[PDB]
Every structure is written in C-alpha cells, then in structure tokens.
Amino acid sequence: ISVRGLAGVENVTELKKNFNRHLHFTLVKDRNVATPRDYYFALAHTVRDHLVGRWIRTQQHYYEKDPKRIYYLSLEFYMGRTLQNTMVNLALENACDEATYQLGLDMEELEEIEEDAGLGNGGLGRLAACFLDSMATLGLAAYGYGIRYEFGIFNQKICGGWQMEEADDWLRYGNPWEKARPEFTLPVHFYGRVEHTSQGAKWVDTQVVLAMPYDTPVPGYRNNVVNTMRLWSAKAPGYIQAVLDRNLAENISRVLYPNDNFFEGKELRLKQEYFVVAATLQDIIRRFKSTNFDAFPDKVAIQLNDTHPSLAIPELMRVLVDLERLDWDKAWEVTVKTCAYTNHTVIPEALERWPVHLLETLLPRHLQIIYEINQRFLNRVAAAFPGDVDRLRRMSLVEEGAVKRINMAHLCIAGSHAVNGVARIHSEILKKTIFKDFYELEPHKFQNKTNGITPRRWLVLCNPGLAEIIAERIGEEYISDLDQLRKLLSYVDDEAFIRDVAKVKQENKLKFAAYLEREYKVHINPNSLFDVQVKRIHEYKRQLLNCLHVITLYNRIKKEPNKFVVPRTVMIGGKAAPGYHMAKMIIKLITAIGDVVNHDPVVGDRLRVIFLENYRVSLAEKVIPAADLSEQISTAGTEASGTGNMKFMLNGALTIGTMDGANVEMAEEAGEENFFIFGMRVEDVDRLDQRGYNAQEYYDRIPELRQIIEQLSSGFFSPKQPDLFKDIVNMLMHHDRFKVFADYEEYVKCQERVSALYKNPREWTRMVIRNIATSGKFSSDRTIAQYAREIWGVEPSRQRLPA
Amino acid sequence: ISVRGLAGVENVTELKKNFNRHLHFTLVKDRNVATPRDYYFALAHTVRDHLVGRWIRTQQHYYEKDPKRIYYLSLEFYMGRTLQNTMVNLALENACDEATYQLGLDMEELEEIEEDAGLGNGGLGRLAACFLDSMATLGLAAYGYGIRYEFGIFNQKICGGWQMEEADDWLRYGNPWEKARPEFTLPVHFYGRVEHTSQGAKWVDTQVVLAMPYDTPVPGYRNNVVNTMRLWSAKAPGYIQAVLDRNLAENISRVLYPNDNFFEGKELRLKQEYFVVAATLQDIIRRFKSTNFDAFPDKVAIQLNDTHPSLAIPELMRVLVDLERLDWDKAWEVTVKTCAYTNHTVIPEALERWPVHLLETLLPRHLQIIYEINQRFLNRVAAAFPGDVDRLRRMSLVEEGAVKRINMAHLCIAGSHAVNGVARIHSEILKKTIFKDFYELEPHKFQNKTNGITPRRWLVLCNPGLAEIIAERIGEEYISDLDQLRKLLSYVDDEAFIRDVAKVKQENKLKFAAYLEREYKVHINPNSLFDVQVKRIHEYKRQLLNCLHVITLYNRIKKEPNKFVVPRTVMIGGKAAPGYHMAKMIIKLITAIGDVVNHDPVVGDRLRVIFLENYRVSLAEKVIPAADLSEQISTAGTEASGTGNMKFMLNGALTIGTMDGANVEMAEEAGEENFFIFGMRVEDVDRLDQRGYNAQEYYDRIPELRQIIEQLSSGFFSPKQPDLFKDIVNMLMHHDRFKVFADYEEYVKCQERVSALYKNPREWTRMVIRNIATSGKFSSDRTIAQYAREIWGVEPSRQRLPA
C-alpha cells in the first residue's frame, strides 16, 4: 500500500541495526531464545526512538513560542495499541515492515502482542484518545491529563454463556511508550480541616497522597509535532503494618471504575477525581509562572471532559484565593474564562451528585468554596429573574432531600465560559430541557461540538486497503483533511471503484473470519451479510431490540424453510458493567439465542448469531472494517452522539438506526435515502411518555412479537432452566424505560429493506460509496478545530515542524 | 590512582557518546534541564551497557560447558551501590572519570546519588553480597536467589536523640541494574490440603501467588565473568475490592523484616521463606532437565544461608516424590547430597522454631514430609545409640511444649551433607554444645568456613589511596589474591611506606569530616583518635560497655582538667530493630551522653561522642577507611564471626576487642601483640555462669563504675526526665545476660594502652602495617574457595573469559 510510505534503503538499514541493538542491550536477549514478544518489544523500542527528538523539539518550540496552552482533563484515555499508530504518523510503516521482513519476521504478527491501553469504558474515553491525536495533528500546544490506572477496563471472558471479569494487567510486560517522571512527583491533600485566620482560610491537618506523573508521546500526522499525555500514579508519602498500609494511598490509581453512563457515589472515585485535578492544576500554575494572573485565561484553557474533573473549578479558586492571594472577584473572573465543560449524556443516573457530608469530610475547603460559589450565582439568578423562587431551587448547586448533594453539572455551568453537547440534537436538548434555566440566564455559554473520530486510527490503521483505493483516485491529502472524501462522489458510477470497494470489504470479512477461527475458534460464513452491534451493553442502546429481530428471522425461517433469505451473521459485542444485572442477563440471552439458532439444521448457514468476546479498541479495528450493516438503534433521545456510528460509516458499512445522536447529522450528510432510518423520533417518544407507555398494547397487536415473548417466558431459549429470562420478560412487558416493543414493527420492516438492497451488490456498493464520501464531517480534526476556534481561542494549523 | 585503570582515547570518546545518547533517548532529557540525578542515570546506563555482552557470553559458556551449578539461597542480599563496583571490576573507573570530567561533571558527586540496595539487616546480608562477588571473581557458575523487597532496611532518622524509622523507597527513581523478566514468572502455592490417592499424595485446593524474577548482573574482577542474582517479586494470579485485594498476595515481597539475630514467628515471614524456596527450586529443576535424578547432586548444589530457606529440604523431597515420582529413599539421598547449611549464631532467640499448627495450615504437604523425615532420622539415632531416649527427645525435629514446633536447624542438619559455622571458635562450639548430639551421630558433616569480605568493595572501592600505595610497592595482583598483602611486612621499617600509610589515613579522616559537616552538619576534630563502633544495636555487642568507657573518659577529664589526654572522637552507629526497647534506649543514651559531653567547655575538643545516623553499606565505605580504632567488644562466645572487624583491619584501623568470633583468627594472623585484646575468654564467661553473675559485686568494688551508674540513675544525662535510663540501669544491675560490668575494668585499662600507643604515631603506624599485611586470610575469595572445594565439589579459577 502506497499510503504506508517509503522503505528507504538507509532507513531500512538503520531500523534493522536499532532492532538488533535493542534486542541485545535493552532486552538482554539473543536470537536463540527470543520469542515473538521479545521481537515486538525490540521493534517498539526502535520505533519509540524516532519520537524522542521530535518530542523534545515540540515542547521547546511551545516554550519559545509561548502559545496559549490547552489542558484536556479526563478520567479516561482509551488509547488502544500504540505501535502501528506511531509508525503511521511518522511515515515508518513500510520501512519497518521491510526491515522486519528482512530479519525473517512478520510485523503484523508482532503488532498483535501489544496490549490495548484500555484506560476507558467506551465512547467518552475513546473520544479523549481521538482528540489527543487531532490536537497533535492540528499543532495545538495541548496536554492530555488523567490517571494511570494500574488496571484498565476488565478483560471479559464468556463462561457458560455469561460474562466473567478478569483484571486487565496491561502493564505486566511493561509499557515502552511511557516515561516515568518521579522527579516531578507532587503532593495531593485530603481530609484535614479549615482554619480561618487573618491570612484568610488555611487548609490544615490534611493527609497527603503523592502524584507521580508518567508522560506518553502523542504524535501528529506527518507534521513532526509530538504532544504529551500526562497520567498521574498514586504513591504513599507497628512498623511492618505501616509499610503494608502504603497500599491505602496507592489504591487511588489502582483500577478504572467500569461503569458506563451510570453514577455510583463511591468515595474512592471522588478521590480519583480530586487527585487528577489537584496535581494537574499545580502543573498548570507552575508552567504559567514560568500582571500575571490577569493574563492566566489568555495562556490557559482547561477543558472538562464530563463533570468528572469538575473539582478543578473550586480547586482553581482555592489556589488563586488561599495561596496566591487574589481577591475572590478577580479569581472568579479568571476561573470562568479558563474553564469550559463538555456534557456527554442527559440520562439522569449518569449525573454526579455528591453527598455534601462526603465532600465536607474529604474536601472541607472545596465545600466552603462551593457554597460561596452557589450563593453568588443564586444572587445573579434572583437579580435577573426577581421573585422566581422555583428557579432558584432548580438552579442551585445544592440539591435538597434526605441527603443534601452538590450537583456537579450545575457547578460546571456556573464556573465555565462555555458548555457544549456532543451532537446537534443533544446540544439543543440541553438548552430546551436539562439546562433550560441556565440557558435562559446565559444564552451565550451554550454551544454544540459534534463528536468525531480520527481517520488515522479509524481508517489508515484499521483499513489500509480502503485507504489505498481511495488514495489511488484522490491522493493522500484526505488523511488530514477528511472533507476531501466528497471527491469520491465522482466515482459512484465508476466500475473500477465499485469493484474495488466491494473487493476491499470482502478481504476485510475474510480477514475477520480468519481472526475469529484462529483466536476464538468460531466459524462464520464469509458470504453472509455481517450485521454488527458493538458498544457497551445497556438497556438504552437496545441490544434486546436486536435480539427480538434475530429471533424473528429464526422463527420466519422455521415457518417457511424453503424460502430464500439473505444469509446473515449477526454479531453483538460489548462489556456489561459488573453489577448491572439486566446488562448481564442480556449477554446471556444473546449467547442463548445462538445456542438454539446456530445448531438448528434447518437454518444451517443462513443465520448465525454470535457474541463477540472482549469488545475493546483493538477488536473494533478488526470488526468494524469487516461490517456490512451497522446497528445504531438507541431509543430516540438517549444516545447523545455516539462515535461507533461514525467509525462504521467511514469503513464501508451501511447504517440501520433511529434519528438519535449524530445519526441525524450522518443521515443529513449522506442524504437520508442512503441510510436505513426507522422508528420513533424524539417527539414520538415524548407523546408516548405523555399518555403512558403500555407494552401490553404491542404484545396484543403483534402476533410475531407475542410468539417471541412466549418462547422466552416458556424456556425455549433455556431448556434446563425454563424461568431464566423471567426478569428480561418482566421489564419488557411492564417496566421498559426504553420502549423496545414500540419500535419492533418498524425495525423489522426496515431490516427487510436492508436485505432487499443486499441482494443487489452493485447498488449496495453504490450506496456505500455515497456514505464513505460524506463521512468527512465526522473527523475529530473538524471537531477539535471547532473547540479551538469557538472555545479555546487558538488557531489550529497543519504547518510542519522542521524534519 | 593507577589501580583505577586506563583512560584510553577511543574508550573515553565512546563513553561520552553513549552518555549523551542515554541522556537523550533513555532519559528524554537535555543539558538545559538535566540535574545531577539525570547525569548519574545517564552514566549508570552507559556503564550497564558494558556488562551486557559479558553477561550473555558467561551464561552461554556455562550452558556449553555444563559445570556443576551453585544455588546460593538467602532471604537477604545487602548489595550497596553498584555503579563504582561495576566500573572497578570492568576496569572502567579512570575512563569514566575522564569522560565525565570532559563533560564538565564530577563522577564522585554522581556516585552519591545512587541509593544503597539495602536488602539486608547487617552481617549475614552483606556476607551474601561479598560471596556473590567472590563467586564471580572465582569463575563459579553461581546463582544468588532471593526476594526483591520493595522496601529494604528502613532509613534511620534521629529525632530528639531517638531512632525514627522511615520506609526505604529504594526503587523510587528506578533500578537501572536489574532486568525484569515477567516472561519467566512462576506459580507458588499456599494453604490447600493433601489428597492421598493411588498416585500418592496430591497437594490440592491451594491459593496461588506468582513469583516474577528480576535478574541483576554480578561482575567478577577483570575476568569478564558476569553471574546472575535472581530476586523474586510477588504478584497476584465485588469487582473493585477483588482488584484492590491483589495487594494481599503482593505483600509477600513488600518489606524486609528488620530484625537482627532475633526470631519472630510471623506468618508473613514464613510465606516469604517459602515463596523464595518454591520459585527458586522450580528454576533449579527446569535448568537441570535442560538417568537424570541420580546425577542431580553432581550438577546441583543448594547452599542455605541460615535456616531461612530451610524449607528447600522438604520442597525438594515434595517435588522429587510427588511430582517426579522418585521413591522416598532415592529422593532423600539426592536431597542430602544437594543441600548444605550455614549456621550464623548460637544465640537462642535467633533460632527458627515454627508452630506446627502454622506449618499445618500454610504448608500441609511440607509438614507431612517433615514428620516422615523426623521419624526416619530418629530411627537412625535409635539404631546408633540404643536406649538413649533423652537423645531422641533432644535431636527430634519436633519440639514439645504447649505449642509444638519444628526446629528448622534440626531439619537442616538432617537434610544436608555439610553444616558449617562462620568462624573457627563458632564451628567448634557447634560441635561441643548446640549440635553435639548431631556431631556425635555424623562427625563428617560438621565443618568451619571462616567468613571473609571482598577486597574489591572493601579496599579498592572504599580506600583508593590505600590500594594505590600498596600497589606502588607490590603491584595489583593482591586485589584478587589478598594473601599477597603479606609482602607488606617487608615495609614495616620503610620510612616512605610508614609516611604514606599515615598520610592516607589522615586524608580519609579529612574526607570523612567533610562528609559529616556537609551532610549531617556535625563538626569533628580531625586531629583526634577516631574511635568507631559501627554495627547493629544489640545487648550482646555491648554498645553499653562503650558508653561506660566514654563516660569514664569524661569523668576522668573533669576530675583532672589540666592533665593531657589523647584527643578522641568516639563514634557509635547502627540500627535498632523497631520494637527492641533496650536497643532503642541505648541509641538515646549515646545521644544523651553527647548532649552533656559535647557542650562542656572544660572538655572542649578533647572528647567528642557522636551517634552516626543511618549506618548502612554506603556509610561503612566512608567511615571505616577513616577509623583509627575498631571496637569489637561482644561478650566472649556471642559474636559467631563478625565481618566488620575484617573491614576495619583491611583499612588501617587497630582493633580493641574480646577473644570472640573471627577476632581470635585476626589476632592469630597479625600476632597478638599487634592487637588490643581484653576481657573474659569463653571459659571465664562459663565459670561466671556456673556460679552466677552478680553485677552488684562489680558495682561495690569499683568506685569509677559506681559513679557512672549513679549519674545515669540520678538523671545527670537526662535532666528534664531524671528517671529516663532507669531501665538500662535495672538490666545492668540485675538482668544483664552479657555481663558488661565484668569486663569494665580490663576494657578501661586496655583503652589506656590504646591511647599510649597513639601518642607515638610512628609506632602506631608500624602496628597498622602489621595488621594490613596479615589481613589476607579474611578475603571472601579464600572463604568461597573453601566452600567450593570442601562442600560444593567445584574447582575455583581465575582464568579470564575472552575480552
């Protein structure tokens, strides 16, 4: 593939030399005992050496130039593997391929050794990872700041058809990409109390946890820019027990909480949040110092990814008032201009509302600062809406009830000059529902920043053949300017391009089928429509609606066995938060459907249903490029944006989905006729809520649906334990918040239209080309350019740094 | 100094290149932000690269040659710093000095950054470290095996005159010398139960702890041999708590137990012991396999450093019988021929006697194997001494009482073909008292291996000037053949040599005084006799007898202020085990004596008493070369050998001590007239024990002693808390096991003779030369050659490996 670059003779010679050098001196191995793992490590170290000069030069350039610095604070960075990504952005892929081939090795085999850096749960974590890449590609002096969890998202095993969790020991064989920086270790304080003297308040008698930073390089695409991701690791500041007890402090960075769109008020999580925020803000203040605080917002932007790091607002006030001696007003003007907040969901149980008692014990000074912030904000509300007493109760940072709580989203809005949603429909709903009172007070604060994905990882890395047939016609500029994909609409009637698109897809399906056979020993039919739903397991995403369709296909086949149907391989994958019973029961239903469907001789290879184990970033890179049909079927109004939808669109799959999140903009970009939109719109969901959702009405009017519920309830998909899915049935019939049954009919009819088009490969491929060609808006470069110009106040750039 | 080698032009050029390369690529630093710490690390990495080829070649040579392999099992390796040692043994010291000087840096300043690898308590730990060095210098295929504690011996701080302990975070900035080997991680089992089937016993339902090895290179002196030290680190094999609970398994290698000559039956310690033994023996069996077991003792020697790893005996039987299917008898013949045990003390509270209940819970199969071992050994005792029923009770591996226990020393003797003491007087006492019943049963098993110290670390590294004036007269061969020091008796009347010895000592005293002023801000008089007692704090070592002398000097000065006395700086240092009350009270007495003595204007600079903080291997390298008088005053019969005594002797100090441990052999080597021997001999200690030690008789007959006890009891050395030393006084007067008062008179008189000779510098220096010259026997090369030929069955060699 030409998009993989040049294999220069001197460069290849040097790479082999450095490979062998690292094998010897760094690994203390030799070719008689080296394993594939040893060879992956020698290549990783060789490749990492190419980033070092660039990394030092970039950081020096930012110091000499003094641009405004962007601090992206997130509790999650779902980075995935780094070896291939580094090669792609430095243009070393073909050279390393050749160098390793000349040494008798297979570079793709080596790449499979690397563990995903799985420091995220799903969407929000991966968005942060795409954003880091785009900010480096756009020449921004941007710093990703988070926590170096020892254990990322658990490794999911399927045992007896059920999810089992295993600790993800991602650091076992080391992380060659990071650089430990113990010399820059800082102190983070907890508990203690406030003394109010004549020098104001003083936070004393605290317990200290040290924050040790680990820096990882983040290379831009061919611009020689190398930015930094700084991740903090927790360290302790009779005798035997006192040494063993150091683990209590070190437990702060031990493991990522594995929830997705769900708030659990755990004190340990609150410590993780504050730990990231306190250490990051000391870095920020020190770098700034190296007259002053007036210009702080001109040199600093702090971006809050969700409310997770919202303690930065009170922490910045604490530092500016208590330690730097600024008056409250000047400090508050600074804080608001520095900070901006990104909201990721309207689902109520996702919102962070910490008990005030907890904040009072753990962070007494922050709680004091929060109450003063609230009092002053509520005084502005009263002056703007005099006599509107309910508004004050609704807008307050303090929530009433048996347990008083602090609404972290309300703190974020009060302390930020910009608040944004992650898709047009979501940003509008914030202004019209959830944050309507805030929007009326300060209309100008409310923005939209439709999410995006990086086309480096999500096209060049994961689908080289696709990237190559595109580059054959329009060159390589589209890799860092994805709106150039629009040029591909010129080839909708081009017989060579139609042939190559379909061939690339078939090669990817063969590559995916080989991976499943080899690694999980699962056999799938390559000449079947690959129907894929990969994302976290949650009732709102409606994996259960997919299950109803799948069973509908099986039941229709059994009713009329001689009738031809487009062969399908239905694949569903994703993790369930440990402790989310319904999510865990859904995984077991998927595997149980497959237990019946996949062994029925009448069905044979016409229909197969498989649960894809351990869905994670590296699996996404394998399965998405192989998919024919992309399932994005959340109840309208529930998926804020989605980003997996975008990946599928860029990789040649057609989409079946509701008008929700960024699906609406994707369908707008491609033309609605080039998408498979079905189901209730947000207005219909609301009308049902207004009159009351009665699932029984659907069961009574739909014979096919009725048949499926009776099989589930009667034990057809669980012969040895007939009442096993009694809980799934109960929720669907009586407490279904996401209205699965209401979209059943239209979803099945829509799926029939999907099959009808798939029977005409030429026309399926032509509609694919119209999707790939209009996928340009969904690049994270576009998104990041919008944050930079509309929020951060910095101009993005593609100009290269000296080679 | 010529003993530091050549600074070749190409070598210096290469070293600078590699320094700068590591600074850039390994450290990701540059000269504008680099600190001394960064420069130490770049030099450490540069130096480590020189060991790598040698290390790979040595291990390959052992594989090709197939010599018998020596496994040295120890719970402690007190290695100290490694940078200077590596340079010395590879002949790179002058070249690196020049290379760093040419880069504008001071190499000795860089060396001070390195943390001691303090994985030992004192003598036994450091012996293991000297032994590793000597085994590499003697070309033996020797493997040091132990545990990689995260925290070594605590860092001692002195606060208000008392010891405070701080965790020794020796790995904070990393360990550049070790190589993690996670690929060779092995499983260690605990608890569970035994199933007795038809395939014999089966240890099932166990809990697993993983043992991850870290390999460190151990370079021989200029022979290009690089051996390995393998240290095991412990790793774990609702959801959140299960991940946080991984620390319970990882706590096994967290911290070294800080006891010295004291047994505490802690279950965690028992796990540490078994963890080292089980993982090491799997390595041993695997390497052996790569007909067979008959030759196992011809290819394997397992050396047990104390009874700490004595579980290797039952573990080897367990593996050979239960897993390899050997019959008990063949397995037991193998085990006895493989294993040998070194005893380090006769002090009763040092002996390991584990509760059988504990062994039964934790290691059920080992306990079963132990009882069968005992039954068979006791059958041999009965057949050899028919009707001697008390002998059976005394020799048994099982000790009776409220809590039945397993005597680990009895297991070691029963399962070893050789048992040795660590000094001639100690090995004889084993045969005559403690192990007399065992000696009568198997006389041939009992040996002596007088301890030694490596003259690389303890002469070339720590006293380059001394090593140089010696090499000026007899060349460099003595560095790996210390008996050549005997050639120095030719210079006892040589005016140039007498001058240079005394000048080297004065330079070392000035260097030590500068270190104390700079680092601890303590001022000492350089023209004072440096009287030093450095070793762990324990009643048997009699720091308290030194305290009585010191107070005697002060009281004599005050009685006759105009009388001239040889000026002295009395320095005492050493750690107290946390929890040993008397040891901790002794440290506070030393500091309290200094509080009065050091501020008395009548005394002025004629007498100074200082407590040296944080005595450790790197401090030993600084203070020992500066000492004039070496205090080795343990009650006769209590110090098995000692090794600090040897260090002092090699470095130009004269010794004041009892006829105990290796002091007897040192005095024998130098001629008793060249030593300051005083006090009770072992026979006198016994006669006192026979009639009963009455400390009151000494108090009543000695007016000067009486004066000191009355000052202590009355509060003279603790004005603000007059009864503070009431406990020290009580023990001395009524429960003194070590009879301090009995040696008081002779010790003071002996000290007067020390002063009388010090007033004649020419004659002091001549007696020093007679000590240095006869210090050759105490090289650890001699000791290791004796283990190799008399126990291991391997011939030591100085032949070089290819350059």
Cβ proximity of B678 and B747 under 8 Å: yes
Cβ proximity of A666 and A646 under 8 Å: yes
User: Tokens at residue A273, please?
Assistant: 């949040």
Angle at the Cα of A650 (from A646 to A654), degrees rounded to 5?
Answer: 80
Facing B30 at nearest CB: one of A56, A182, A255: A56
Q: Which residues contact B512 (CB under 8 A, 6 or more apart)?
A: B530, B622, B623, B625, B626
The rounded distance, in Å, linking the Cα atoms of A218 and B264 is 52
User: Computed over its alpha carbons, how large is the radius of gyration of chain B?
Assistant: 27
Best B37, B149, B240 member to test A by mutation, with max A CBs in 10 Å, is B240
Closest CA of chain B from A265, distance in Å: 14
The rounded distance, in Å, linking the Cα atoms of A4 and A107 is 13
The rounded distance, in Å, linking the Cα atoms of A350 and A259 is 9
Assign residue B700 a region (left: φ > 0; alpha: ψ between -120 and 50; beta: otherwise): alpha
Buried b (16+ CB within 10 A) or exposed e, B584-593: ebbbbbbbbb
Q: CA-CA distances (angstroms) from residue A793 to A132, A300, A330?
A: 17, 10, 20
Judge if A402 and A505 occupy the same domain: no
The rounded distance, in Å, linking the Cα atoms of A72 and B514 is 50
- Could you tell me how many residues make up chain B? 803
Phi, psi of B529 (to 5 degrees): -70, 125
Which residue's structure tokens are 């243009």?
A91
Angle at the Cα of A790 (from A789 to A793), degrees rounded to 5?
Answer: 55
User: Tokens at residue A589, please?
Assistant: 């239903």
Contact between A165 and B30 using a beta-carbon 8 Å cutoff: no
Cβ proximity of B334 and B416 under 8 Å: no
Closest CA of chain B from A443, distance in Å: 41
Paired residues of A569 in beta bridges: A530, A608
Which residue's structure tokens are 């942060």?
A128
User: Tokens at residue A542, please?
Assistant: 């409606």
What single DSSP character describes residue A219?
Answer: E
Complete DSSP assignment for A585-635: HHHHHHHHHHHHHTT-TTTGGGEEEEEETT--HHHHHHHGGG-SEEEE-PP
Q: Of the residues B541, B568, B616, B766, which is catalytic?
A: B541
The rounded distance, in Å, linking the Cα atoms of A614 and A574 is 7
Cβ proximity of A78 and A120 under 8 Å: yes
Contact between B247 and A243 using a beta-carbon 8 Å cutoff: no
Facing A25 at nearest CB: one of B52, B236, B246: B52
Judge if B28 and B133 occupy the same domain: yes
Judge if A399 and A466 occupy the same domain: no
Q: Of the residues B22, B50, B344, B616, which is catalytic?
A: B344
B484 burial level (CB within 10 Å; 0-12, 13-18, 19+)? middle
The rounded distance, in Å, linking the Cα atoms of B707 and B551 is 10
Max CA-CA distance within chain B? 89
Contact between A182 and B167 using a beta-carbon 8 Å cutoff: no
Element (H, E) at A384: helix A364-384
The rounded distance, in Å, linking the Cα atoms of A360 and A368 is 8
Contact between A49 and B25 using a beta-carbon 8 Å cutoff: yes
Closest CA of chain B from A184, distance in Å: 11
Q: CA-CA distances (angstroms) from residue A156 to A118, A120, A162, B59, B116?
A: 12, 14, 10, 41, 43
Judge if B630 and B673 occupy the same domain: yes
Q: Which domain holds residue A320?
A: 1-452+780-800
Judge if B377 and B457 occupy the same domain: no
Look at residues A254, A181, A249, A255 and name the one whose alpha carbon lies nearest to residue A216: A181
Complete DSSP assignment for A164-183: EEE---TTTT--SS-EE-GG
Residues of chain A contacting B55 with CB distance shorter than 8 Å: 28
Q: Which amino acid is at A694?
A: N
Contact between B239 and A182 using a beta-carbon 8 Å cutoff: no
Look at residues B451, B454, B465 and name the one whose alpha carbon lies nearest to residue B625: B465
The rounded distance, in Å, linking the Cα atoms of B59 and B227 is 7
Alpha-carbon dihedral of residues B616, B619, B620, B622, nearest 10 degrees?
170
What single DSSP character describes residue A347?
Answer: -
Cβ proximity of A582 and A588 under 8 Å: no
Q: CA-CA distances (angstroms) from residue A72 to A141, A145, A280, B266, B376?
A: 11, 6, 10, 48, 71
Complete DSSP assignment for A463-508: -HHHHHHHHHHH-SGGGG-GGGGGGGGGGTT-HHHHHHHHHHHHHH
User: Tokens at residue B481, please?
Assistant: 């053949």
Kindly give the interhelix angle for A123-137 and A780-787, rounded to the nearest 10 degrees. 80
User: Computed over its alpha carbons, how large is the radius of gyration of chain A?
Assistant: 27
Look at residues B343, B306, B345, B342 and name the one whose alpha carbon lies nearest to residue B640: B345
The upper half-sphere exposure of residue B401, i.e. CA atoms within 13 Å in the direction of its Cβ, equals: 13
The rounded distance, in Å, linking the Cα atoms of B256 and B76 is 8
Look at residues B519, B466, B228, B42 and name the one whose alpha carbon lies nearest to residue A28: B228
Give the residue ranges of the annotated binding site of B for AMP: 30, 63, 286-290
What single DSSP character describes residue A560?
Answer: S
Cβ proximity of A7 and A98 under 8 Å: yes
Judge if A241 and A342 occupy the same domain: yes
Look at residues A560, A623, A551 and name the one whose alpha carbon lies nearest to residue A592: A551
Q: Are strands A339-342 and A418-421 parallel, antiparallel or unpaired?
A: parallel
Q: Of the residues B22, B647, B770, B777, which is catalytic?
A: B647
Assign residue B549 a region (left: φ > 0; alpha: ψ between -120 and 50; beta: otherwise): alpha
Q: Which amino acid is at B292?
A: N
The rounded distance, in Å, linking the Cα atoms of B20 and B30 is 9
Element (H, E) at B198: none
| Three-class SS state of A448 | strand
Contact between A238 and B578 using a beta-carbon 8 Å cutoff: yes
Q: Output the domain CATH number for residue B560.
A: 3.40.50.2000
Active site residue A357: no
Structural domains counted in chain A: 2
User: Tokens at residue B291, please?
Assistant: 């007909």
Closest CA of chain B from A167, distance in Å: 7
Phi, psi of A118 (to 5 degrees): -90, 50
Cβ proximity of A651 and A466 under 8 Å: yes
Element (H, E) at B313: helix B312-318
Cβ proximity of A262 and A239 under 8 Å: no
Judge if A372 and A467 occupy the same domain: no
| Three-class SS state of A665 | helix
The rounded distance, in Å, linking the Cα atoms of A96 and A322 is 54
The rounded distance, in Å, linking the Cα atoms of B304 and A97 is 51
User: Tokens at residue B6, please?
Assistant: 């050549």
B34 burial level (CB within 10 Å; 0-12, 13-18, 19+)? middle
| Three-class SS state of A265 | coil
Determine the distance from the C-alpha atom of residue A415 to the mean position of all C-alpha atoms in its chain, rounded to a whole number: 25
The rounded distance, in Å, linking the Cα atoms of B372 and A139 is 74
Facing A578 at nearest CB: one of B28, B154, B239: B239
Judge if B337 and B239 occupy the same domain: yes
Look at residues A746, A345, A714, A752 and name the one whose alpha carbon lies nearest to residue A545: A746
Judge if A770 and A787 occupy the same domain: no
A779 burial level (CB within 10 Å; 0-12, 13-18, 19+)? buried
The rounded distance, in Å, linking the Cα atoms of A589 and A542 is 13
Q: Which residues contact B364 (CB under 8 A, 6 or more apart)?
A: B191, B192, B193, B194, B203
Look at residues A312, A313, A331, A311 and name the one whose alpha carbon lies nearest to residue A321: A331
Which residue's structure tokens are 């969890």?
A149
Cα-Cα end-to-end distance for chain A:
23
The rounded distance, in Å, linking the Cα atoms of B208 and B235 is 9
Judge if A276 and A332 occupy the same domain: yes
Look at residues B226, B202, B188, B210 and name the one whose alpha carbon lies nearest to residue B58: B226
Look at residues B160, B5, B180 and name the one whose alpha carbon lies nearest to residue B89: B5
Buried b (16+ CB within 10 A) or exposed e, B264-280: eeeeebbbbbbbbbbbb
Beta strand spans in A149-296 (E): 155-159, 162-166, 179-180, 186-196, 201-219, 226-235
Angle at the Cα of B715 (from B713 to B719), degrees rounded to 5?
Answer: 170
Cβ proximity of A203 and A181 under 8 Å: no
Q: Which amino acid is at A42?
A: A
Phi, psi of B679 (to 5 degrees): 80, 180
Buried b (16+ CB within 10 A) or exposed e, B732-743: bbeebebbbbbb
Q: CA-CA distances (angstroms) from residue A190 to A235, B138, B601, B705?
A: 14, 55, 49, 55
Q: Which residues contact A458 (CB under 8 A, 6 or more apart)?
A: A130, A621, A624, A646, A647, A650, A651
Judge if A315 and A416 occupy the same domain: yes
- CB–CB contacts below 8 A, A to B: 81
Q: Which residues contact B579 (CB under 8 A, 6 or more apart)?
A: A238, A239
Q: Are strands B201-219 and B179-180 parallel, antiparallel or unpaired?
A: antiparallel
What single DSSP character describes residue A348?
Answer: G
Angle at the Cα of B65 (from B62 to B71), degrees rounded to 5?
Answer: 40
Q: Which residues contact A490 (CB under 8 A, 6 or more apart)?
A: none
Kindly give the interhelix angle for A543-559 and A581-597, rounded to the nearest 10 degrees. 20
Nearest CA in chain B to A235: B172
Look at residues A406, A404, A347 and name the one whose alpha carbon lies nearest to residue A374: A406
Cβ proximity of B507 and B469 under 8 Å: no
Sign of CA dihedral A626, A629, A634, A638: positive
Best A25, A243, A269 member to test B by mutation, with max B CBs in 10 Å, is A243
Phi, psi of A736 (to 5 degrees): -85, 100
Q: Of the residues A456, A647, A739, A770, which is catalytic?
A: A647
Judge whether A675 is annotated as a binding position.
no
Q: Which amino acid is at B2?
A: S
The rounded distance, in Å, linking the Cα atoms of A210 and A151 is 19
Cα-Cα end-to-end distance for chain B:
23
Judge if B254 and B292 occupy the same domain: yes
What SS3 string covers A425-445? HHHHHHHHCCCHHHHHHCHHH
Q: Which amino acid is at B547?
A: C
Determine the distance from the C-alpha atom of residue B636 to the mean position of all C-alpha atoms in its chain, rounded to a whole number: 20
Q: CA-CA distances (angstroms) from residue B5 to A557, A624, B105, B133?
A: 87, 63, 19, 19
Judge whether A63 is annotated as a binding position.
yes
Look at residues B19, B44, B23, B46 and name the one whose alpha carbon lies nearest to residue A52: B23
